[PDB]
Design a protein around this ligand. Structure first.
Ligand SMILES: *[C@@H]1O[C@H](CO)[C@@H](O)[C@H](O)[C@H]1NC(C)=O
Lengths: 50, 49
């Protein structure tokens, strides 16, 4: 029984891989939950000049 | 100093003015409970109760 042990990334940020996922129009300032490459957030998104 | 007979009496005076600050009111914030604790989420109204 081949017991070769493999290991992928353990809690690392996005890399040169991109899972089979689609795309959709982005959200500029809508106060809604958003999804951009897994990360999800809610509240109000406001644009700054930083 | 003093003995069986003595006393001190002022001869002139001097009017003085001094401030005394005193807090009265404090800008009152109105913080709600849900949003802060939990924003807009599907499980927000079920686990909260
Ligand atoms: C006011 O005080 C001074 C000393 O500071 C004193 O010489 C004077 O006599 C006083 N005023 C009067 C009207 O006496």
């Amino acid at each position: 029984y081949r017991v070769v042990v493999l290991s992928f990334e353990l809690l690392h940020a996005p890399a040169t891989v991109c899972g089979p996922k689609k795309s959709t129009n982005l959200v500029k300032n809508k106060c809604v939950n958003f999804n951009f490459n897994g990360l999800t957030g809610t509240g109000v998104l406001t644009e700054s000049n930083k | 100093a003093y003995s069986n007979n003595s006393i001190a009496i002022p001869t002139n005076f001097t009017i003085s003015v001094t401030t005394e600050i005193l807090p009265v009111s404090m800008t009152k914030t109105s913080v709600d409970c849900t949003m802060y604790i939990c924003g807009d989420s599907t499980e927000c109204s079920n686990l909260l109760l």
